[PDB]
Every structure is written in structure tokens, then in C-alpha cells.
Design a protein around this nucleic acid. Structure first.
Lengths: 294, 797, 105
DNA sequence: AAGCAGTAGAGCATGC
DNA sequence: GCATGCTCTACTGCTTCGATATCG
């Protein structure tokens, strides 16, 4: 029940904090416990009765943001360790699952139809564990995470799961102001995203539904100074997000967030000749009259 | 190493990639040549010393960045690419240098191997024999580190078997060749961690190798075998630690005898010297019970993964030694996983091995010899595949019938008990074999019917079934008058014989009524009976409405009478006879009808037959006119096993009320006075202070009067006595108000004037409950009853 | 009390017809013999020797009875009393219409 | 410090 | 380790009375 899940979480935090003081001989065995538990909760059925990934989210949320409300009576230095073990276990799970398309995208199908469900369970799980508590913990992770995800995405293009993780990492990088001076790691990750944005922009023209929404979400999560140099290439992605947003409301949300970021930070004269086609597709949202749509 | 090394840590990675590309071009040596003496590289050992010395402070604790570790692995791959460097790297691994963060110790070589672990293992698998020799040369000096490194190398060479499968066998052979160099580990007075490191090393070897553990050849076998025997036969270890030398007993239960006798010998010594004294007497939760259960789970894992007679016999001896072992469902699950494994030859080995446990003499007890068949062999025979069940059958036919035709010895009770137990076990084996075999290879001209006679034969195939049916019938239709030695064992034997008769008749007879000739035929003028020989006519049965443990399910709910071990196959045959082939009642029902509807039959037979009619009521629902008088006779009878509205009477009246529209008791006056006595009994015993039971009794009585409603006299004098209590502190008047609400709910009048209450006095004691204003359930319920009665009397004037 | 319970344990040991259980039980009855020498309870000693003798002579247990007469498990040797200096001489001098259907098919 | 009417919610049974 | 009523206990308000301290 609730208020017993808090007791289970204080138990797990006490075990990790107990063996985190035993040197680096057992500090290694925080990693494989977090890894084995993440594989365990990422092999449920895809969304007495069966639980899914949605129930372990408060567990892994209290694990990575509630050492402060626990250690301060237990008779940030553990939050950081558990965050690092979570990100290591995420990209360790990514570099081991079998995601290969078999001719049964006409009718391509997974060679490992159990590893694919585990990967997509991992994606929808990790979409709500990483965006909290990024203000220092993700900043040494940005380049390595994004580099590994781009190389896994280049050889698995039609995946709809690597663009979601890439949208997560670029949103977490924008939340901590990563691209400001553009540190050899910051410019390398910058130029990496500059090239990968154009690559995903060209390969999404063949995509249809959730591949298309995933690539659109990734492209409109990109920072302004990566878009500020190639605005005419990203503007049709904004028009397509404002058009697909009439039936998919998260895509209208990422389109409105993209446009409010562009109109504030991108310059006023490079943005000026593009409102003539950005703004007319907002007219579909202003079709409310409260008649039988009350 | 630090937080700003990003302008000076970007150039070391560049020269590392440059020198890796040189080494790929084959000219790393020409640009960076050996400025050292013979074999070490002056740059390579400088790199290795750099990476090793820069993880410790000579400056509090250098915590590695995410790129600090990847630069360190690149520097380490370059140092190993320069050449040589196996000896210095091994001597750095086995270095007893001690560190400290802030106090904790954690040796320097262990932290170095824990950080990198994979470049090091890739190197140590790249130059093998020198690594293993120089690593097992220093086994006594640092016994923890050599075990850690050899385990890491061995399970890292397991995972690379998709391409380097030849490397694992080479590493296993070379690590076995130096097994004398670790003989100080599995010795007397050794610490337990080195004894467990031997077991882990042996587990990884035996995972990566094959022909070491199960041959008598290849050379290295005696040295590993005495290691294993001395580790699992010692006293100085602990029982749950010695349980972890049992999970790799799969690798050794395939070697032929001589040594397999020694393996049985050390296992039997472990059982008689570590397991509880034959009756699981360790109280559950103590440190003895814990180690016992976790050892036996790994033992069953070994038995279910490597199916062998040497383990099955031993676990069946420890399972079938007392009345009920702790882990019953575990033993049954292990046997069910033993049977269905393919390989139609090795199942019959298990069947013969566990049959020989109760076939031979070895005199222990009755229950011990019957539990060999009961808890193990029937589980095996019920799930082994159909092809492996005819070989066991043909092997046991002759000795089975030779035991079944014998005469007992009532002078001596012990061999009499053994003969009863053996004959009952043979009846159980024949039961299951007749159950799960098709009719052709048991009744047509086939090898099984040939094998009871000499060679083959020309007969149409009825020379086994007849000599078995006569034996079964002569078994379950015995008759004792002065015979009084062993009534329990012989009664269970009667039940097993009757069940084997069921299972033989349900297979080979199909035509009309050969069921009747043996299953439902007694001879009271010769005292040749059935159900008196089946059911214990002495036990007190309870039938409780309420239960402590709910869900007593198997399927048919087992209560006390429903686990009679003859009720479930009887219900099986009765449901069989409904879909194999009005006319009033057949003889297979007329025998039961004459057995059910008599108060001169014992009570337990009547309750047994009643529960049979209950459990299968889709077969008496056609003949409901005849099958409703004796059930109602038992429900409204005098003796039923309980002093209230118990579960048996609730069950009978629920089934009979389901039979409404098919047989109402308005036809004969006998069933009418039974129905009136039933209603008076139900209305007398309603209350039972648990309120859900009270509401259930009221719903029963309401559905009873609603269903029949015609041939009933409402006991108005009882209801008057039920609400007429002049005490304004008791809910005792609520029961009469509830019964009055029931009888007013359908159509029925209040106060038929025959009951001698003189209606003024009746209705005054009824309406007097309105003044009892303490509990709502008295005065408001009385008010609502008076409202219903007044609407009634206004409605029909 | 505990002597009674371990005599039940010894009866369960003779119940089991395995190989090491026999030696386990003969070690238990040897231990009971020693603690019967050093508790001055010769009534109970003759009682248990008669108990095992009549139990395993109304039963068989032929192999354990062979090891009883092969090692030596017998009544007390001294004077049927509470002390002497006497050898195993007392051991040596004491035990040295169905008929129709049966063819209608 | 106690009688005496009036009530509100605390504590508990019960739920199949 | 939750939801719903039911009983009945404990409290308040009002009012009388009696014991105590105080004043002409």
C-alpha cells in the first residue's frame, strides 16, 4: 500500500548506504543490484494482477531524489552515486538487448520479440526518471550518453525509441544551460547534435506515424543556437508538429514550446519571414465554440 | 586526474589513439623502440605503472571521472600492446598494498582489478599459460586474489564462446593441470572462504569443460574427484555452505560405479550426519531448520536438472520416511519436472529404481513402504510419457499378479501388514496404468496381454482383465466377523482395490452395463458387500458452516468426506456413465437408491452417497423424482453429524431447491411431512450469532418457502415464541420479526388460527416490539413487518 | 524422560534399514550402556535390554541382530546387582453372479 | 458540585 | 494495511444549592 512503499524505499536506501561505506569492493555491488532490478522491472507486459513500469516510478524517483528526506535522520553523496548507477545501467541495458528487424518498413519484425518489449519498457520508464534532478547530475553524462545513443540510432534508424531517449538527454542539457559558450566536450557534443539533427531530418521523410512523431519531438527539443543556423530546415518540422498536434496533443505541446523558445532566443529577422506559414496552422486549435463541445 | 584536466587530458587520448593506429599498422615498435634491457618495454611498463599508481593517493581519494576511466583503459590497452608485460601485471595484481579513503582498507591489487577487469582479462586470456602458471605459483601468498582473478578470467572466457570457444577449453585444461598448486585450499583447518573459492572455481571449470567430471580417463579426474569428495564429506564446513557443493553434483551423477558408489557413500553420510532425525523435528525458524531447507532445495535442483536414480532413490527415501515432510509441493514439482524430459529410455530407469524401493524386502514400516509408491511413484507414473509406461508395465505384470494372487498370514501381524501394503501398492500402480493407457494396447491382441501368458497367444485379449477383475472384486468384497487385527490398513487396501476396479472397467468395457457387474453389486444373503468394506463406520464427521482456512480446493472442494480417496474416482465414473449411454432408475442407481433411502444403513454411508449425489448432480437431475425423497429424508432426518443447520443440510437443501420444477414434494404425504419437519427444523435453528450466517439461513428458509410454498405448514407458534420475549434490552425478538418478514414476503397469511395463540395475544406480542426502542432492528423492523401485514389484510379483506 | 525420547529415536533408527543408521544406533546404545554404568540404575538397564531383546525377537532385523551377537549387546554381567569385577562370561553363557462375467467376454 | 436534557463523534463491528 | 453505520459515552449548558470569604 502507500505508506508502506515509503518503508520499502527507506529499507533499500539503508542497504545501499550501508554497503556504500564498505569501500569500493562492495560499492561495485550497488551497480549490479540497480542493474538487475532495472532489468526485472523492464520485462513486464507492455501497456494478484500484473504490475507494469508505472508502479516502480515512485520507487526509482525516491531513490534518486529522497536521500535528503531519509539520511537526515538515518543516524546528495548517495543521490549522485545512485544516479550514476542508473545511467550506467541504462546504457548497459541498451548495449546488450537484441533489436533486429526481420522480414516476415513493409512488415519488418523483431528477431528478439522479447528484447524489443524490454527496450520500449525501458524507454517509457526512463522518460520519467531522468527529467527530475538533472541540475548537476547529468552534466558529466551529456556527451557520452548522446554519443552512444546517436551511434545506436544510426544503425537502427526506424526504432521510435532512440529519438525519445535523445529528446530526454537534449532537454536535460537545455535545462542546465549546457550550450552557452558555443571545454572540448561541450563543442564536441554540440557539433555532434548539429550533424545528427540534419541526419534525422532527412531520414524522417520516409517515416509515417510514431517514428515521425518521435523524430519531430527530437528535432523540436533541439536548442535554439543549433536551430538558429539552419532555421529553414527545421521550420517544416514545426509545421508538421502543429498539423499532427490536432490529433496528438503532446506534439502540439512540443510545438508550442519550440515556438516560444524560438521567438524569444532566435533573432528577430531570421525568424521574420517564417511566421507566414508557422502561424496559419495554429487556426485549427481555435475552433472551439462550446456548443456540444462543452 | 581531477576536475579541470580537460585541456591536458585531451592530448593523452590523442597520442593513445595515434599509437593504437601505429600498432594496427604494425610499426609501433619502430617509432617507440625499446629503451629497456631485455623484454619489458620502457614505455609500456611506465604506462602500466602510471595507471596503477594513479588510482591511489601517495591527495585523499581520486574519484574517477567518466572519461578518466576510459582514458585509463586506453592507456592500459596501449601498455599491453607494447608487448610482454604479463609478469609485471600479474605481480601488480598479487600485491598486498593497502589503501584508505578516509578507516577501511581494500588492497591495491584488488581495487585495480575491480576497476578495469576486462582489459586485464583480455590480456590474460591473450597470453594464457604463463599467466596461469605464474598465478598459481603464488596461491598460498594471496589466496583471495588468485581466486578472484581466475574466476574473472574463467567466466569472461565463458562469454566469449561465440568466437573464442577454443580458448575456454585450453584455459580449463591448463588451470586443471596445476590443481596441485591449490591443494592448500581444500585442506583441514582452512578458512571457509578458500573452501568456497575452490567450489566456485570448480563450478566455472565444469561449466566451460565437459570430459573432466564424468569420465574415468583424461588424467585430471582423481585430483578433482578427491577435492569434491573431501569438500562435501567434511565436518568443519557448515550445512548450507556444503549445500553449495551440491549444485554441481549434476556434473557427477553420470559416472559409472566404483566411484559412483563412493559418491553415494558420501551423500548418505551427509544425510545421516547432517539432516534432522527422521521427523523434521527442527522448529521452523531456528538456524538448523534454515540450513536444512536451503540445502534440500539445492539438492532437489540437482535431482531435477540431472535426473538420475542415485539421487531419486535418496530424495524419495528422505521424502517418504515420515508422515508428511515439510516441502511436499517441492518434491512433487521436482518429480513432475523429472518425468516429462523426453528420452524414453531414461524414464524407465527412474521408474524401476523407485519401484525397487518398495518391491524388495528391507523391512521398515507399512507407511514407509506405501509412501514409496504413494508420494513418488504415482507422481512419476502420472506424468511420464505414454511410451515409457508400457515398458514399466510389462516389466511389472508377472510379479504384480504373483503378489496379488497370494494368501496372507494372519498368525504374524508384521508380514501381514507388509503383504497388505504391497497388495495395495500394486493396486494403485495398476489403477494409474489402466487410467492413462488407451484401450487397444491393453485389451486387443497386444504384447502386454501376451506377456501375462507364455510368449504370445491367439486369444482375443481378455486373459489379464478377468484374472485382475476377479482379484479386485475378491479384494474389495471381503467380509470380516471375527477378523480384527488391522482394520485401517485393510480398509485402505479395499479402497485401492475398488479404485483399481473403477480404472480397469472404465477402459476395457464400453457396451452397456458391465459397470454393474462389479462396481454396484452386493450379496447380503452371502455377506459379500461393497460400501461397508469401503467406508469407515466409526468416525465422527463434522460438516462446519464456518471455516478458519478458506478455499479448501483441490475441482471438487475437499472438506473431510471429500478426501475419502474413493469419492473422486466414483464421481469420475458417474460422470463417465452419463456420456457413454424416463425409464425410472437403472440398477446402478437402484442400488444407490436402496442404499441411500434407509435409516437402517449406517450414517457414514448415507452421508457419503449424499455427497456423491451433491458432487455430481448433473446426472441425478434427469431422475430427480426418485432422487429427491431420500435426500430430503437425510436433510430432514434426525442424525446428520451436527446439532444445527450445518453444511451437509445446507448443501442438500440447496441442491433440492435447484431441483424445483422437476420434483415438488406435493405428491406423497411422506415427502410432505418431511418438508414440514424440514421447515420447522430450519426455522428453529436459524440464529448463529455470526450475522452473515444468520442472513444465509434466512435466505435459505426464504428460498425454501418460495420454491415449495404449497405443501408447507408455517410454524406460527414457533415464530410467536421467537418474537414474544418481554425484555427491552435484547435483540432476541429480531428473529421472529425476520421469520415473519420472510413469510409475509411471498404471499402467506399471518396467524392461521390452528396454533393455539388466540390472535389478539399473538398480534399484541408482535406489535409490542414497537416500544422496545433501543436497537433499530427491533422496533423499526417490527414496524415494517406490521406495515406489510396491514397491507396484506387490507389487500385481501 | 530424554532417555525415553532417545529410545524412541533408537527405535526409529532400527526402523530405518540403511547402512550407516545401524552404526549410528549401536553407538547410541553403547552411549546408553556407558551412562547406565555411571548412573546406578540397573533395574532400568535390565529393563531396556529385555525391551530391545523382545522387540527385535518379535521382529526380525536379522542384520542388526547379527551385529548384536557379533559385537556384544546383552544383559548385565556382574551379579545382577550394583557392582562386581566380572568379564563377559555372562554374555558367553547366555547367548553364544460374478462367475458368469468371468467368462462372459 | 451535582442533576438533567441534549448531542456528537469515538470506537468498534462488519463486510463473503 | 478500507468503508459504513450504530451504539453509547462523555461532554456542555443551565440551574440549584451549599460552603466559604466579606461587609454594615
Amino acid at each position: 500500500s502507500p505508506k508502506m512503499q515509503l518503508v520499502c524505499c527507506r529499507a533499500i536506501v539503508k542497504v545501499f548506504l550501508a554497503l556504500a561505506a564498505k569501500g569500493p569492493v562492495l560499492r561495485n555491488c550497488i551497480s549490479t543490484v540497480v542493474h538487475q532490478g532495472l532489468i526485472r522491472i523492464c520485462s513486464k507486459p507492455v501497456v494478484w494482477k500484473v504490475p507494469t513500469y508505472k508502479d516502480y516510478v515512485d520507487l526509482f524517483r525516491h531513490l534518486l531524489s529522497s536521500d535528503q528526506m531519509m539520511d537526515s535522520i538515518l543516524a546528495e553523496s548517495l543521490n549522485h552515486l545512485l544516479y550514476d548507477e542508473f545511467v550506467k545501467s541504462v546504457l548497459k541495458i541498451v548495449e546488450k538487448l537484441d533489436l533486429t528487424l526481420e522480414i516476415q518498413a513493409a512488415n519488418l519484425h523483431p528477431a528478439k520479440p522479447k528484447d524489443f518489449s524490454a527496450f520500449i519498457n525501458l524507454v517509457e520508464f526512463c522518460r520519467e526518471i531522468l527529467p527530475e534532478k538533472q541540475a548537476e547530475f547529468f552534466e558529466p553524462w551529456v556527451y557520452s550518453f548522446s554519443y552512444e545513443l546517436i551511434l545506436q540510432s544510426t544503425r537502427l534508424p526506424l526504432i521510435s525509441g532512440f529519438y525519445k531517449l535523445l529528446s530526454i538527454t537534449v532537454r536535460n542539457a537545455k535545462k542546465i544551460k549546457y550550450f552557452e559558450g558555443v571545454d572540448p566536450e561541450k563543442y564536441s557534443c554540440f557539433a555532434l547534435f548539429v550533424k545528427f539533427g540534419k541526419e534525422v531530418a532527412v531520414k524522417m521523410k520516409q517515416y509515417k506515424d510514431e517514428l515521425l512523431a518521435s523524430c519531430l519531438t527530437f528535432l523540436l527539443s533541439l536548442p535554439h543556437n543549433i536551430i538558429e543556423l539552419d532555421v529553414r530546415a527545421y521550420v517544416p518540422a514545426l509545421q508538421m508538429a502543429f498539423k499532427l498536434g490536432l490529433s496528438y496533443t503532446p506534439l502540439a505541446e512540443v510545438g508550442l514550446n519550440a515556438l516560444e523558445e524560438w521567438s524569444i532566443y532566435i533573432d528577430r529577422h531570421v525568424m521574420q519571414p517564417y511566421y507566414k506559414d508557422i502561424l496559419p496552422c495554429l487556426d485549427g486549435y481555435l475552433k472551439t465554440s462550446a456548443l456540444s463541445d462543452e | 586526474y581531477g576536475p579541470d584536466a580537460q585541456v591536458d587530458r585531451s592530448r593523452l587520448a590523442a597520442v593513445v589513439s595515434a599509437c593504437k593506429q601505429l600498432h594496427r599498422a604494425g610499426l609501433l615498435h619502430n617509432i617507440l623502440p625499446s629503451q629497456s634491457t631485455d623484454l619489458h618495454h620502457s614505455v609500456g611498463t611506465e604506462l602500466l605503472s602510471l595507471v596503477y599508481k594513479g588510482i591511489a593517493p601517495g591527495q585523499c581519494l581520486p574519484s574517477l571521472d567518466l572519461s578518466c576511466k576510459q582514458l585509463a583503459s586506453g592507456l592500459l590497452e596501449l601498455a599491453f600492446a607494447f608487448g610482454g608485460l604479463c609478469e609485471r601485471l600479474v605481480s601488480l595484481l598479487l600485491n598486498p598494498a593497502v589503501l584508505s579513503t578516509a578507516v577501511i582498507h581494500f588492497s591495491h591489487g584488488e581495487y585495480f582489478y575491480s576497476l578495469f577487469s576486462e582489459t586485464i582479462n583480455t590480456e590474460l586470456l591473450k597470453n594464457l599459460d604463463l599467466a596461469v602458471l605464474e598465478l598459481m605459483q603464488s596461491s598460498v601468498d594471496n589466496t583471495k586474489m588468485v581466486s578472484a582473478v581466475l574466476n574473472g578470467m574463467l567466466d569472461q572466457s565463458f562469454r566469449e564462446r561465440a568466437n573464442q570457444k577454443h580458448q575456454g577449453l585450453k584455459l580449463a585444461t591448463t588451470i586443471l593441470q596445476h590443481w596441485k598448486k591449490c591443494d592448500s585450499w581444500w585442506a583441514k583447518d582452512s578458512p571457509l572462504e578458500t573452501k568456497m573459492a575452490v567450489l566456485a572455481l570448480l563450478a566455472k571449470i565444469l561449466q566451460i569443460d565437459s570430459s573432466v567430471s564424468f569420465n574415468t580417463s583424461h588424467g585430471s579426474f582423481p585430483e578433482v574427484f578427491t577435492t569434491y569428495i573431501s569438500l562435501l564429506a567434511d565436518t568443519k564446513l557448515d550445512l548450507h555452505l556444503k549445500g553449495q557443493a551440491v549444485t554441481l553434483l549434476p556434473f557427477f551423477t553420470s559416472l559409472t560405479g566404483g566411484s559412483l558408489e563412493e559418491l553415494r557413500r558420501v551423500l548418505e553420510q551427509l544425510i545421516v550426519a547432517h539432516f534432522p532425525m527422521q521427523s523434521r523435528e527442527f522448529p521452523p525458524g531456528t538456524p538448523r531448520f534454515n540450513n536444512y531447507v536451503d540445502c534440500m532445495k539445492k539438492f532437489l535442483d540437482a535431482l531435477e536438472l540431472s535426473q538420475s536414480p542415485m539421487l531419486l532413490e535418496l530424495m524419495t527415501e528422505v521424502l517418504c520416511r515420515e508422515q508428511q515432510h515439510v516441502m511436499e509441493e517441492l518434491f512433487q514439482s521436482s518429480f513432475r519436472r523429472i518425468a516429462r524430459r523426453g528420452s524414453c529410455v531414461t524414464q524407465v530407469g527412474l521408474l524401476e529404481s523407485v519401484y525397487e524401493m518398495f518391491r524388495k524386502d528391507d523391512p521398515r514400516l507399512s507407511f514407509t513402504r506405501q509412501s514409496f509408491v504413494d508420494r513418488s511413484l504415482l507422481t512419476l507414473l502420472w506424468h511420464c510419457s505414454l511410451d515409457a509406461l508400457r515398458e514399466f508395465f510389462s516389466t511389472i505384470v508377472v510379479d504384480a499378479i504373483d503378489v496379488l494372487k497370494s494368501r496372507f498370514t494372519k498368525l504374524n501381524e508384521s508380514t501381514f501388514d507388509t503383504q497388505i501394503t504391497k497388495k495395495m501398492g500394486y493396486y494403485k500402480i495398476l489403477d494409474v496404468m489402466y487410467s492413462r493407457l488407451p484401450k487397444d494396447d491393453v485389451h486387443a491382441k497386444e504384447s502386454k496381454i501376451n506377456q501375462v501368458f507364455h510368449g504370445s497367444c491367439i486369444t482375443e485379449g481378455n486373459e489379464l482383465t478377468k484374472t485382475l477383475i476377479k482379484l479386485c472384486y475378491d479384494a474389495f468384497t471381503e467380509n470380516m466377523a471375527g477378523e480384527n487385527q488391522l482394520l485401517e490398513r485393510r480398509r485402505l487396501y479395499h479402497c485401492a482395490a475398488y479404485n483399481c476396479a473403477i480404472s480397469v472397467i472404465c477402459c476395457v468395457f464400453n457396451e452397456l452395463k458391465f459397470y454393474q457387474g462389479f462396481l454396484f453389486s452386493e450379496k447380503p444373503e452371502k455377506n459379500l458387500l461393497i460400501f461397508e468394506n469401503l467406508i469407515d463406520l466409526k468416525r465422527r464427521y463434522n460438516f462446519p458452516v464456518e471455516v478458519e482456512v478458506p478455499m479448501e480446493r483441490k475441482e471438487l472442494e475437499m472438506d473431510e468426506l471429500n478426501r475419502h480417496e474413493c469419492m473422486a474416482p466414483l464421481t469420475a465414473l458417474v460422470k463417465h456413465m452419463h456420456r457413454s449411454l424416463p425409464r425410472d432408475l437403472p440398477s446402478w442407481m437402484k442400488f444407490l437408491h436402496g442404499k441411500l433411502g434407509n435409516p437402517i444403513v449406517p450414517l457414514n454411508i448415507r452421508l457419503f452417497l449424499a455427497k456423491l449425489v451433491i458432487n455430481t448432480e448433473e446426472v441425478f437431475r434427469p431422475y430427480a423424482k426418485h432422487w429427491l425423497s431420500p435426500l430430503l429424508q437425510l436433510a430432514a432426518s434426525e442424525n446428520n453429524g451436527g446439532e444445527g443447520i450445518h453444511y451437509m443440510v445446507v448443501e442438500i437443501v440447496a441442491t433440492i431447491l435447484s431441483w424445483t420444477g422437476l420434483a415438488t414434494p406435493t405428491g406423497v404425504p411422506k415427502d410432505e411431512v418431511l418438508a414440514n419437519r424440514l421447515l420447522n427444523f430450519l426455522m428453529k435453528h436459524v440464529f448463529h450469532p455470526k450475522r452473515a450466517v444468520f442472513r444465509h439461513n434466512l435466505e435459505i428458509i426464504k428460498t425454501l418457502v418460495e420454491c415449495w410454498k404449497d405443501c408447507l405448514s408455517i410454524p406460527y407458534r414457533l415464530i410467536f415464541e421467537k418474537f414474544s420475549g418481554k425484555d427491552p434490552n435484547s435483540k432476541d425478538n429480531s428473529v421472529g420479526i425476520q421469520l415473519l418478514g420472510i413469510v409475509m414476503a411471498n404471499d402467506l397469511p399471518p396467524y392461521d388460527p390452528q396454533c393455539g395463540i388466540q390472535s389478539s395475544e399473538y398480534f399484541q406480542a408482535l406489535v409490542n416490539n414497537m416500544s422496545f426502542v433501543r436497537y433499530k432492528e427491533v422496533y423499526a423492523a417490527a414496524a415494517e413487518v406490521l406495515g406489510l401485514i396491514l397491507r396484506y389484510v387490507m389487500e385481501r379483506k | 524422560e530424554a532417555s525415553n525420547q532417545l529410545i524412541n529415536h533408537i527405535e526409529q533408527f532400527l526402523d530405518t534399514n540403511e547402512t550407516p543408521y545401524f552404526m549410528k544406533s549401536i553407538d547410541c546404545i553403547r552411549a546408553f550402556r556407558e551412562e547406565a554404568i555411571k548412573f546406578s540404575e540397573e533395574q532400568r538397564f535390565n529393563n531396556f535390554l529385555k525391551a530391545l531383546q523382545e522387540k527385535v525377537e518379535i521382529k526380525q532385523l536379522n542384520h542388526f541382530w547379527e551385529i548384536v551377537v557379533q559385537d556384544g549387546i546383552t544383559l548385565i554381567t556382574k551379579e545382577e546387582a550394583s557392582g562386581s569385577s566380572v568379564t563377559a562370561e555372562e554374555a558367553k553363557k547366555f547367548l553364544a453372479d460374478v462367475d458368469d462375467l468371468l467368462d462372459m467376454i
